[PDB]
Amino acid sequence: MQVILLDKVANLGSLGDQVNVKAGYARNFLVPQGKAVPATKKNIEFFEAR
Amino acid sequence: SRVCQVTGKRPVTGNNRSHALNATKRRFLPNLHSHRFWVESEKRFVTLRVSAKGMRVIDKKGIDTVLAELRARGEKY
RNA sequence: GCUUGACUGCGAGCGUGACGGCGCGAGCAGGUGCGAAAGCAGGUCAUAGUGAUCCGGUGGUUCUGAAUGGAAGGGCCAUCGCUCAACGGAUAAAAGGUACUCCGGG
RNA sequence: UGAGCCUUGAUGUGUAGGAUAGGUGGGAGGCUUUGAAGUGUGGACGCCAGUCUGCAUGGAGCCGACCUUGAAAUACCACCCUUUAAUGUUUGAUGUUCUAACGUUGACCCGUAAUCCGGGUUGCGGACAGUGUCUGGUGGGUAGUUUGACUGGGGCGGUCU
RNA sequence: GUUUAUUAAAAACACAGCACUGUGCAAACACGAAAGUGGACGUAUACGGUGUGACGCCUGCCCGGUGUAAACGGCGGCCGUAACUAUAACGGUCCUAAGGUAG
RNA sequence: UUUUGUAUAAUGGGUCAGCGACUUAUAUUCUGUAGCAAGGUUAACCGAAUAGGGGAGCCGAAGGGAAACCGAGUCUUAACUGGGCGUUAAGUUGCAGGGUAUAGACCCGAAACCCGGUGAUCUAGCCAUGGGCAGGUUGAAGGUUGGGUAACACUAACUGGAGGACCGAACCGACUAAUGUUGAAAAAUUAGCGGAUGACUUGUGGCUGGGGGUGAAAGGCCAAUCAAACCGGGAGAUAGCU
RNA sequence: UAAGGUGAUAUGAACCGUUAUAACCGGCGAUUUCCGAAUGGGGAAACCCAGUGUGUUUCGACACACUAUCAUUAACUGAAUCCAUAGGUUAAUGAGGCGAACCGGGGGAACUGAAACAUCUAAGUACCCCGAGGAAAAGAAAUCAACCGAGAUUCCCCCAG
């Protein structure tokens, strides 16, 4: 789902992209381990600003 | 207890209806699972008995605003 | 030999049964058939040939239509599916064998 | 590896034929010596008529109604149908790798002069195991189905309208 | 030895022995909506379930349906064979897997 | 009292005194009485509180048809000579009484079902800690010597003291006979009987709780009870029975 | 307020007071043993067994204020593990228990009727559990109605069996 990456993880990321990934990746790689942010429809526009 | 700590879901009593409509009491058990979380703020592995629907809610919101209302209603972790 | 009166809407009044039922039924109106005509025909010489209620199938009736016009559903008419044979037909729902038998009594 | 798909390009004989031209639509100027029609096969399709393209005979025409075809443009521009090819997207099967999910009734350390519990580190399995929702089948091990009425001391056996 | 204390003490129940089935440990199985516990601080010479009932002669044949029958089970015909009958350890058949051994 | 039939030997009452059974609440129907009369009546409420106000609402004077609809006519049918149902004939509000239905509904009296608690001081089993078993008799393994063998095997004394061994006291149990059967005792006594060094028995404390527990298994026991304990409640369950 | 009184079975004894300190009746304050939420540890209820600061012209043993549990906050300390949590102690606040009915919520049967019986029914009733108060709950429409309109919630009588 709509999580945006931050790191040099393998080829679905380019230092930040909106993707449609499976649930394990989001929760058990990206929720609480780091490298991402949840899509609260505010954080995505905030990091679009950043 | 089998209580979803995030959404508040708990088992309720239902009935397994037959073809002859014989009533038998049964409780619907929510898909509850224990999963460990790693908070960068407090430097600790916290585990929570949540549902998969609670997992989807905490994927939508985030761990911090969920803990902000877990500290509210007397929950322990 | 000719024909559909084995037609619809009826029908006073009656017998017989606790009732439903069954049976005859003069005669009205329309439309028919036979006969030259008078007249007769609303099934089978009569007494048995039967399955009611519920559900479902088919068509119609513009009868109703949870805001309006529809529509759905319901109601009315005609009809069909049951050895419901235990047949005036108890519930959606049991049949059996003990020769695998046992107890009590005469 | 099987199925769909995004982009790139070919793909279609009533029959003769510069050429196996699909359908409805615009259209009278475009290219080649930054090397062209017209002829040939290999893998390839086949009604062996030939075409596609790698290669190649060749070195100056193709073209627009064209002098041919029942239906005219491989002069150009568009959404497309069938066939078929390429990597890749998407979804399944097979087996392998992981270490993060998860389990650990393996060992160690701390809270802790604690066989509870919690945390860390390490190892072992491992997307199984186990669990929630729905559902197919199995299951007289259990239950509800209640399993009808008339019969003279009597052994047979029937009857119901 | 034990049992129906208060109408039945035994031919009933149990019994070591013998045998079968299942269980590889976080065991089978059981009490538990779960935690946990028993099994067991035991490890296939151990444990659970079942059948028989000391001991001797002994347990013969069959795995087709659910190689293994001391499981759920079966052990029927035709002729041949132990001095004048019958029975047939044994050896063929009917392809149904095969037919009562000893006593 | 029940019966076709009771003095019947079919059921009940020893006697007396006291208590004790067709009611209450709500709808509906009928009769009598009472006001008003094509009208009758108020519910909640206000209230100087059984007064008065308050007519929201109910019944009836119009019915037919399933209904739209039509209307003193309506339904049926194309329409009836027609047929069914009605029409100009008074109801309503009170009170009392006789019924109906709902509730325990004239009164007393089941095997059963479920819920919440209490019991392992009795008994069944287990765990932890202690105690008891008079006396006599028989004599296993092992140790030594002798006979026998190349040496064991086998044999004869002595030592040794093992037995789910024997006889038999306390103790445990009740197989026979007798008494007791309004008992001495809601299971005992008297005389015989079996075990009595074990699978023995006992004291104390704990554990196992009812659709369960326990059970060397009788469907035995769980407080003199058990083919599902007691206490309280649903419950005044239900009865076509007496 | 007072000439009577010291409650009753219950006399008797010993007394007090009579014109203002007898008794009677009321408000306030204190004492308020022990068990019992029971609260220092235990506990077979009215019992047993301890520690810290304060006091002994008799400084032995003891009395006084304390020392139970949970939730939150603050402070001080404080692990693997740097940072920081968890953990420990103290201070303050609140609660623990009882109580006839009423309220909200979570579980929640069968007897009986249906003349059998399983749908239904009894019934969200009996019973259990948690919490709160003098009331609780609910309460200002994503409510009705039908083209007119009503205008939070609550209770009663009709509509309406």
PDB file of N, CA and C (backbone and C1' of nucleotides) in Angstrom, chain F residues 81-107:
ATOM      1  P     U F  81     -84.478  -8.675 -16.271  1.00  0.00           P
ATOM      2  O5'   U F  81     -85.675  -9.700 -16.025  1.00  0.00           O
ATOM      3  C5'   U F  81     -85.969 -10.200 -14.727  1.00  0.00           C
ATOM      4  C4'   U F  81     -87.149 -11.137 -14.752  1.00  0.00           C
ATOM      5  C3'   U F  81     -87.437 -11.899 -13.465  1.00  0.00           C
ATOM      6  O3'   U F  81     -88.044 -11.126 -12.431  1.00  0.00           O
ATOM      7  C1'   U F  81     -87.466 -13.412 -15.257  1.00  0.00           C
ATOM      8  P     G F  82     -88.164 -11.669 -10.906  1.00  0.00           P
ATOM      9  O5'   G F  82     -86.958 -11.013 -10.074  1.00  0.00           O
ATOM     10  C5'   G F  82     -85.612 -10.937 -10.541  1.00  0.00           C
ATOM     11  C4'   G F  82     -84.968 -12.294 -10.725  1.00  0.00           C
ATOM     12  C3'   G F  82     -84.247 -12.878  -9.516  1.00  0.00           C
ATOM     13  O3'   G F  82     -85.119 -13.559  -8.629  1.00  0.00           O
ATOM     14  C1'   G F  82     -82.826 -12.988 -11.398  1.00  0.00           C
ATOM     15  P     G F  83     -85.071 -13.268  -7.048  1.00  0.00           P
ATOM     16  O5'   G F  83     -83.756 -14.017  -6.544  1.00  0.00           O
ATOM     17  C5'   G F  83     -83.717 -15.430  -6.398  1.00  0.00           C
ATOM     18  C4'   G F  83     -82.317 -15.914  -6.106  1.00  0.00           C
ATOM     19  C3'   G F  83     -81.670 -15.352  -4.845  1.00  0.00           C
ATOM     20  O3'   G F  83     -82.024 -16.066  -3.674  1.00  0.00           O
ATOM     21  C1'   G F  83     -80.187 -15.092  -6.659  1.00  0.00           C
ATOM     22  P     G F  84     -82.129 -15.309  -2.260  1.00  0.00           P
ATOM     23  O5'   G F  84     -80.615 -15.031  -1.847  1.00  0.00           O
ATOM     24  C5'   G F  84     -79.799 -16.059  -1.304  1.00  0.00           C
ATOM     25  C4'   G F  84     -78.447 -15.528  -0.896  1.00  0.00           C
ATOM     26  C3'   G F  84     -78.456 -14.451   0.182  1.00  0.00           C
ATOM     27  O3'   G F  84     -78.507 -14.992   1.492  1.00  0.00           O
ATOM     28  C1'   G F  84     -77.091 -13.755  -1.619  1.00  0.00           C
ATOM     29  P     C F  85     -79.359 -14.264   2.644  1.00  0.00           P
ATOM     30  O5'   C F  85     -78.539 -12.935   2.958  1.00  0.00           O
ATOM     31  C5'   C F  85     -77.239 -12.989   3.528  1.00  0.00           C
ATOM     32  C4'   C F  85     -76.551 -11.650   3.441  1.00  0.00           C
ATOM     33  C3'   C F  85     -77.289 -10.494   4.095  1.00  0.00           C
ATOM     34  O3'   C F  85     -77.083 -10.437   5.494  1.00  0.00           O
ATOM     35  C1'   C F  85     -76.550  -9.847   1.938  1.00  0.00           C
ATOM     36  P     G F  86     -78.234  -9.860   6.451  1.00  0.00           P
ATOM     37  O5'   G F  86     -78.116  -8.283   6.275  1.00  0.00           O
ATOM     38  C5'   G F  86     -79.166  -7.423   6.685  1.00  0.00           C
ATOM     39  C4'   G F  86     -78.997  -6.044   6.102  1.00  0.00           C
ATOM     40  C3'   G F  86     -80.184  -5.108   6.254  1.00  0.00           C
ATOM     41  O3'   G F  86     -80.223  -4.484   7.524  1.00  0.00           O
ATOM     42  C1'   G F  86     -79.387  -5.030   4.028  1.00  0.00           C
ATOM     43  P     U F  87     -81.631  -4.134   8.211  1.00  0.00           P
ATOM     44  O5'   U F  87     -82.145  -2.857   7.411  1.00  0.00           O
ATOM     45  C5'   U F  87     -81.412  -1.641   7.428  1.00  0.00           C
ATOM     46  C4'   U F  87     -81.925  -0.676   6.387  1.00  0.00           C
ATOM     47  C3'   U F  87     -83.411  -0.359   6.449  1.00  0.00           C
ATOM     48  O3'   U F  87     -83.733   0.610   7.429  1.00  0.00           O
ATOM     49  C1'   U F  87     -82.788  -0.823   4.211  1.00  0.00           C
ATOM     50  P     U F  88     -84.213   0.146   8.889  1.00  0.00           P
ATOM     51  O5'   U F  88     -85.166   1.323   9.375  1.00  0.00           O
ATOM     52  C5'   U F  88     -84.781   2.678   9.216  1.00  0.00           C
ATOM     53  C4'   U F  88     -85.867   3.476   8.546  1.00  0.00           C
ATOM     54  C3'   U F  88     -87.244   3.389   9.181  1.00  0.00           C
ATOM     55  O3'   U F  88     -87.375   4.208  10.332  1.00  0.00           O
ATOM     56  C1'   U F  88     -87.424   3.187   6.821  1.00  0.00           C
ATOM     57  P     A F  89     -88.147   3.669  11.639  1.00  0.00           P
ATOM     58  O5'   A F  89     -87.053   2.832  12.448  1.00  0.00           O
ATOM     59  C5'   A F  89     -86.901   1.432  12.252  1.00  0.00           C
ATOM     60  C4'   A F  89     -87.660   0.632  13.281  1.00  0.00           C
ATOM     61  C3'   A F  89     -86.859   0.160  14.486  1.00  0.00           C
ATOM     62  O3'   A F  89     -86.706   1.162  15.475  1.00  0.00           O
ATOM     63  C1'   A F  89     -88.178  -1.625  13.642  1.00  0.00           C
ATOM     64  P     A F  90     -85.255   1.787  15.766  1.00  0.00           P
ATOM     65  O5'   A F  90     -84.740   0.990  17.045  1.00  0.00           O
ATOM     66  C5'   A F  90     -83.494   0.300  17.025  1.00  0.00           C
ATOM     67  C4'   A F  90     -82.593   0.712  18.166  1.00  0.00           C
ATOM     68  C3'   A F  90     -82.985   0.192  19.550  1.00  0.00           C
ATOM     69  O3'   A F  90     -81.801  -0.012  20.317  1.00  0.00           O
ATOM     70  C1'   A F  90     -82.934   2.544  19.583  1.00  0.00           C
ATOM     71  P     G F  91     -81.107  -1.456  20.425  1.00  0.00           P
ATOM     72  O5'   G F  91     -79.562  -1.102  20.579  1.00  0.00           O
ATOM     73  C5'   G F  91     -78.849  -0.508  19.505  1.00  0.00           C
ATOM     74  C4'   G F  91     -78.323   0.863  19.860  1.00  0.00           C
ATOM     75  C3'   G F  91     -77.433   0.953  21.088  1.00  0.00           C
ATOM     76  O3'   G F  91     -76.102   0.540  20.831  1.00  0.00           O
ATOM     77  C1'   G F  91     -78.989   2.741  21.089  1.00  0.00           C
ATOM     78  P     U F  92     -75.216  -0.120  21.997  1.00  0.00           P
ATOM     79  O5'   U F  92     -74.796   1.112  22.917  1.00  0.00           O
ATOM     80  C5'   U F  92     -73.942   2.135  22.426  1.00  0.00           C
ATOM     81  C4'   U F  92     -73.979   3.359  23.307  1.00  0.00           C
ATOM     82  C3'   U F  92     -73.495   3.166  24.735  1.00  0.00           C
ATOM     83  O3'   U F  92     -72.084   3.231  24.843  1.00  0.00           O
ATOM     84  C1'   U F  92     -75.546   4.357  24.741  1.00  0.00           C
ATOM     85  P     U F  93     -71.307   2.311  25.906  1.00  0.00           P
ATOM     86  O5'   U F  93     -71.466   3.097  27.282  1.00  0.00           O
ATOM     87  C5'   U F  93     -70.946   4.410  27.434  1.00  0.00           C
ATOM     88  C4'   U F  93     -71.560   5.117  28.618  1.00  0.00           C
ATOM     89  C3'   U F  93     -71.427   4.411  29.957  1.00  0.00           C
ATOM     90  O3'   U F  93     -70.165   4.624  30.564  1.00  0.00           O
ATOM     91  C1'   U F  93     -73.655   5.186  29.668  1.00  0.00           C
ATOM     92  P     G F  94     -69.396   3.412  31.286  1.00  0.00           P
ATOM     93  O5'   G F  94     -69.941   3.447  32.783  1.00  0.00           O
ATOM     94  C5'   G F  94     -71.013   2.608  33.187  1.00  0.00           C
ATOM     95  C4'   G F  94     -71.761   3.176  34.367  1.00  0.00           C
ATOM     96  C3'   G F  94     -72.003   2.204  35.511  1.00  0.00           C
ATOM     97  O3'   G F  94     -70.894   2.107  36.388  1.00  0.00           O
ATOM     98  C1'   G F  94     -74.031   3.287  34.964  1.00  0.00           C
ATOM     99  P     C F  95     -70.255   0.675  36.735  1.00  0.00           P
ATOM    100  O5'   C F  95     -71.271   0.051  37.789  1.00  0.00           O
ATOM    101  C5'   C F  95     -71.587   0.737  38.990  1.00  0.00           C
ATOM    102  C4'   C F  95     -72.759   0.093  39.680  1.00  0.00           C
ATOM    103  C3'   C F  95     -72.687  -1.419  39.803  1.00  0.00           C
ATOM    104  O3'   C F  95     -71.881  -1.853  40.885  1.00  0.00           O
ATOM    105  C1'   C F  95     -74.817  -0.803  38.994  1.00  0.00           C
ATOM    106  P     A F  96     -71.055  -3.228  40.773  1.00  0.00           P
ATOM    107  O5'   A F  96     -72.162  -4.359  40.944  1.00  0.00           O
ATOM    108  C5'   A F  96     -72.879  -4.490  42.160  1.00  0.00           C
ATOM    109  C4'   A F  96     -74.071  -5.397  42.006  1.00  0.00           C
ATOM    110  C3'   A F  96     -73.787  -6.775  41.439  1.00  0.00           C
ATOM    111  O3'   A F  96     -73.267  -7.674  42.403  1.00  0.00           O
ATOM    112  C1'   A F  96     -75.671  -5.856  40.354  1.00  0.00           C
ATOM    113  P     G F  97     -72.207  -8.799  41.963  1.00  0.00           P
ATOM    114  O5'   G F  97     -73.092  -9.888  41.211  1.00  0.00           O
ATOM    115  C5'   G F  97     -74.107 -10.604  41.899  1.00  0.00           C
ATOM    116  C4'   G F  97     -75.057 -11.276  40.940  1.00  0.00           C
ATOM    117  C3'   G F  97     -74.437 -12.270  39.975  1.00  0.00           C
ATOM    118  O3'   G F  97     -74.222 -13.540  40.561  1.00  0.00           O
ATOM    119  C1'   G F  97     -75.890 -10.830  38.795  1.00  0.00           C
ATOM    120  P     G F  98     -72.962 -14.428  40.118  1.00  0.00           P
ATOM    121  O5'   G F  98     -73.457 -15.152  38.790  1.00  0.00           O
ATOM    122  C5'   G F  98     -74.652 -15.916  38.783  1.00  0.00           C
ATOM    123  C4'   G F  98     -74.961 -16.423  37.401  1.00  0.00           C
ATOM    124  C3'   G F  98     -73.771 -16.963  36.628  1.00  0.00           C
ATOM    125  O3'   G F  98     -73.472 -18.301  36.983  1.00  0.00           O
ATOM    126  C1'   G F  98     -75.049 -15.524  35.240  1.00  0.00           C
ATOM    127  P     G F  99     -71.976 -18.857  36.830  1.00  0.00           P
ATOM    128  O5'   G F  99     -71.869 -19.205  35.283  1.00  0.00           O
ATOM    129  C5'   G F  99     -70.643 -19.055  34.590  1.00  0.00           C
ATOM    130  C4'   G F  99     -70.867 -18.952  33.105  1.00  0.00           C
ATOM    131  C3'   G F  99     -69.611 -18.891  32.256  1.00  0.00           C
ATOM    132  O3'   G F  99     -69.062 -20.174  32.023  1.00  0.00           O
ATOM    133  C1'   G F  99     -71.139 -17.226  31.544  1.00  0.00           C
ATOM    134  P     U F 100     -67.492 -20.438  32.228  1.00  0.00           P
ATOM    135  O5'   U F 100     -66.837 -19.863  30.896  1.00  0.00           O
ATOM    136  C5'   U F 100     -67.321 -20.254  29.621  1.00  0.00           C
ATOM    137  C4'   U F 100     -66.826 -19.328  28.542  1.00  0.00           C
ATOM    138  C3'   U F 100     -65.351 -18.980  28.609  1.00  0.00           C
ATOM    139  O3'   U F 100     -64.529 -20.002  28.078  1.00  0.00           O
ATOM    140  C1'   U F 100     -66.617 -17.016  28.220  1.00  0.00           C
ATOM    141  P     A F 101     -63.345 -20.618  28.967  1.00  0.00           P
ATOM    142  O5'   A F 101     -62.076 -19.759  28.538  1.00  0.00           O
ATOM    143  C5'   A F 101     -61.806 -19.514  27.166  1.00  0.00           C
ATOM    144  C4'   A F 101     -60.998 -18.258  26.978  1.00  0.00           C
ATOM    145  C3'   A F 101     -59.825 -18.076  27.923  1.00  0.00           C
ATOM    146  O3'   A F 101     -58.691 -18.831  27.539  1.00  0.00           O
ATOM    147  C1'   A F 101     -61.034 -16.051  27.760  1.00  0.00           C
ATOM    148  P     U F 102     -57.741 -19.484  28.657  1.00  0.00           P
ATOM    149  O5'   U F 102     -56.760 -18.296  29.058  1.00  0.00           O
ATOM    150  C5'   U F 102     -56.027 -17.597  28.063  1.00  0.00           C
ATOM    151  C4'   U F 102     -55.521 -16.274  28.578  1.00  0.00           C
ATOM    152  C3'   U F 102     -54.746 -16.318  29.882  1.00  0.00           C
ATOM    153  O3'   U F 102     -53.401 -16.730  29.714  1.00  0.00           O
ATOM    154  C1'   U F 102     -56.315 -14.548  29.951  1.00  0.00           C
ATOM    155  P     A F 103     -52.983 -18.256  30.001  1.00  0.00           P
ATOM    156  O5'   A F 103     -51.976 -18.156  31.229  1.00  0.00           O
ATOM    157  C5'   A F 103     -52.448 -18.235  32.565  1.00  0.00           C
ATOM    158  C4'   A F 103     -52.270 -16.924  33.288  1.00  0.00           C
ATOM    159  C3'   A F 103     -52.102 -17.017  34.793  1.00  0.00           C
ATOM    160  O3'   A F 103     -50.771 -17.325  35.167  1.00  0.00           O
ATOM    161  C1'   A F 103     -53.691 -15.345  34.278  1.00  0.00           C
ATOM    162  P     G F 104     -50.475 -18.166  36.502  1.00  0.00           P
ATOM    163  O5'   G F 104     -51.579 -19.315  36.489  1.00  0.00           O
ATOM    164  C5'   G F 104     -51.232 -20.666  36.758  1.00  0.00           C
ATOM    165  C4'   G F 104     -51.955 -21.185  37.974  1.00  0.00           C
ATOM    166  C3'   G F 104     -53.431 -20.823  38.065  1.00  0.00           C
ATOM    167  O3'   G F 104     -54.239 -21.756  37.369  1.00  0.00           O
ATOM    168  C1'   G F 104     -52.343 -20.482  40.166  1.00  0.00           C
ATOM    169  P     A F 105     -54.996 -21.345  36.016  1.00  0.00           P
ATOM    170  O5'   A F 105     -56.500 -21.118  36.482  1.00  0.00           O
ATOM    171  C5'   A F 105     -57.153 -22.064  37.323  1.00  0.00           C
ATOM    172  C4'   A F 105     -57.986 -21.397  38.392  1.00  0.00           C
ATOM    173  C3'   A F 105     -59.211 -20.627  37.899  1.00  0.00           C
ATOM    174  O3'   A F 105     -60.264 -20.754  38.853  1.00  0.00           O
ATOM    175  C1'   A F 105     -57.770 -19.162  39.075  1.00  0.00           C
ATOM    176  P     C F 106     -61.415 -21.860  38.660  1.00  0.00           P
ATOM    177  O5'   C F 106     -61.768 -22.298  40.150  1.00  0.00           O
ATOM    178  C5'   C F 106     -62.020 -21.319  41.146  1.00  0.00           C
ATOM    179  C4'   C F 106     -62.088 -21.916  42.530  1.00  0.00           C
ATOM    180  C3'   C F 106     -60.873 -22.697  43.002  1.00  0.00           C
ATOM    181  O3'   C F 106     -59.810 -21.866  43.431  1.00  0.00           O
ATOM    182  C1'   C F 106     -62.858 -23.854  43.588  1.00  0.00           C
ATOM    183  P     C F 107     -58.291 -22.387  43.355  1.00  0.00           P
ATOM    184  O5'   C F 107     -58.169 -23.431  44.553  1.00  0.00           O
ATOM    185  C5'   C F 107     -58.263 -23.002  45.902  1.00  0.00           C
ATOM    186  C4'   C F 107     -58.211 -24.160  46.869  1.00  0.00           C
ATOM    187  C3'   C F 107     -57.046 -25.120  46.702  1.00  0.00           C
ATOM    188  O3'   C F 107     -55.840 -24.632  47.264  1.00  0.00           O
ATOM    189  C1'   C F 107     -59.053 -26.341  47.026  1.00  0.00           C
TER     190        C F 107
END
